[PDB]
Amino acid sequence: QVQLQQWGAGLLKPSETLSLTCAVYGGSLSGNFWSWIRQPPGKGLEWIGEINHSGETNHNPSLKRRVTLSVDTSKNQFSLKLSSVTAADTAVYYCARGGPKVYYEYWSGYVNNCFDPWGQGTLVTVSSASTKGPSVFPLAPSSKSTSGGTAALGCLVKDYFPEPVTVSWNSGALTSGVHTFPAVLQSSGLYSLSSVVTVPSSSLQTYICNVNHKPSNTKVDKRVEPKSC
């Protein structure tokens, strides 16, 4: 079974050069093309490029003069460079085995340029921000955040970088009714998410959100008490 192992820098500043590497195990680079494909968060797939064991490269014409593909046959690896990186390049980058080389009677070359197997995928984020700890603000329950015997509260994990952060409720004891939303990349380059929880009205009961950010090693235990409205 041919296995693919991805690695490379997951953090870049704007205009820098993305560099990713993909090692092939259980098989050789010979006899197939090897492609890099990418997928922005919440969006579709986009074929970046392909390179074979001989060094021949092809790339998406929409990317113009950015793709630089390389092959290390001695290591059975292939690498992708994407210079002049921008915010539109923040994506999960997969490497996969492209089409094999077939030998027929009158023609020989590469066919069936589909992708199998796939790599695990490396998330490359483009941002001018550095490591920064989050600020946890209480989304407090009130008359505006209640519907009958059902109220809602939570926490806002604002301005942190990079991904990710973990949010628990009452040190993991509160799991039902919890919705931890995917983070959004703010215009400031910092991430931000919201973790809400639905509870009964009669309980309004201690609620504490535990936010953990490993890249900054910042842990915040914020108690959410009801406000007024």
């Binding site: 492609s35 579709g44 797939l45 986009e46 074929w47 392909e50 092809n58 998406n60 014409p61 929409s62 997969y94 089409g99 069936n112 340029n113 589909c114 992708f115 199998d116 197997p117 796939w118 790599g119 695990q120 995928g121 600020s135 603000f137 209480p138 989304l139 407090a140 009130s142 505006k144 955040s145 209640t146 519907s147 059902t150 809602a152 939570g154 806002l156 604002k158 919705h179 931890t180 939303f181 995917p182 983070a183 959004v184 703010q186 931000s192 998410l193 919201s194 809400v196 639905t198 406000k227 007024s228 409205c229």
Partner: protein, 215 residues
């Protein structure tokens, strides 16, 4: 010339055990049978589901089939298993490899209106000079829910970001969170902050508002 692939529909809402049909049209003819279908589950890499239009890789169950030619191709799931609800892409390799936008197969359930809550910014955040007003749309179906922000009945534009959860495993509903970010000064300059929600489960858009100072 690149071959643009368009899949149909965008989202396919079916029940477990039903038949799923995903169409894939191309702007140009795909030579021979140079088309493949991939399946992707959330948080996972795309898996080769079908190669060569109709051929099936080793391990892929019999319920997945592929047909078509020229510019029209079709992926078919005869009996939708629970593990089949995911995104499906089509890719041509007659010329430069291009993908379709993708088709999401999700659980079909009854229309559920969102429970709309609103959260003012905390005093601790106002001390920092930024006001975040959060609007929560809890447990709704289908996923399509429009959130608009109105500051003193003035429609906002550009200062709002929303995030949606994956389809819940128990009730198959979605939840949405919309953050409206203003400066502390712009927050103190205004009074009424309202979140307007338009959803298929609502006979009219519901507005959850609060007046600054009283909240």
């Amino acid at each position: 010339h690149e071959i643009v692939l368009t899949q149909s529909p965008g989202t396919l809402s079916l029940s477990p055990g039903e038949r799923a049909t995903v169409s894939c049209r191309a702007s140009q003819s795909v030579s021979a049978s140079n088309l493949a279908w991939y399946q992707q589950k959330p948080g996972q890499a795309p898996r080769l589901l079908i190669y060569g239009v109709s051929s099936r890789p080793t391990g892929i169950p019999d319920r997945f089939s592929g047909s078509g030619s020229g510019t029209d191709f079709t992926l078919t799931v005869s009996r939708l298993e629970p593990e089949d609800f995911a995104v499906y892409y089509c890719q041509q390799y007659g010329s430069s490899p291009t993908f379709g936008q993708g088709t999401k197969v999700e659980i079909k359930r009854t229309v559920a209106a969102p429970s709309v809550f609103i959260f003012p910014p905390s005093d601790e955040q106002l001390k920092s000079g930024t006001a975040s007003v959060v609007c929560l749309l809890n447990n709704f179906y289908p996923r399509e829910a429009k959130v608009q922000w109105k500051v003193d009945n003035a429609l906002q534009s550009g200062n709002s970001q929303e995030s949606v959860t994956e389809q819940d495993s128990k009730d198959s509903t979605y939840s949405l969170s919309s953050t409206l970010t203003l400066s502390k000064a712009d927050y103190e300059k205004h009074k009424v902050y309202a979140c307007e929600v338009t959803h298929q489960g609502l006979s009219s858009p519901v507005t959850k508002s609060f007046n600054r100072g009283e909240c």
